Homo-oligomer: A and B are copies of this chain.
Amino acid sequence: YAYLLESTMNEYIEQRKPCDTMKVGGNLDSKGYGIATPKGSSLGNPVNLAVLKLNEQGLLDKLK
């Protein structure tokens, strides 16, 4: 049994005991995870700016 999942989760499991799984081949597509809010939410604009600010400062890479 082989499992189709997002590269992020695959890479995480590949580093966990019992270290018996592995990610193979290239990614099938390219996409992203985003912080979601209800349509027309007040928070939308500010959280988008926060995500951009935090990626630019190196925090997102640091956290991964």
- Residues on the B chain within 8 Å of A30, using CB: 55, 60-61
Nearest neighbor of A27 in chain B, beta-carbon distance: B61
Chain B CB within 8 A of A16 CB: no
Nearest neighbor of A29 in chain B, beta-carbon distance: B61
Chain B CB within 8 A of A17 CB: no
8 A-B pairs in the complex with CB atoms less than 8 angstroms apart: A29-B55, A29-B56, A29-B58, A29-B61, A30-B55, A30-B61, A31-B55, A32-B32
Ranked nearest first, the 4 interchain pairs of A and B with the lowest CB-CB distance are A31-B55, A29-B61, A30-B61, A30-B55
A interface list, Cβ under 8 A from B: 29-32, 55-56, 58, 60-61
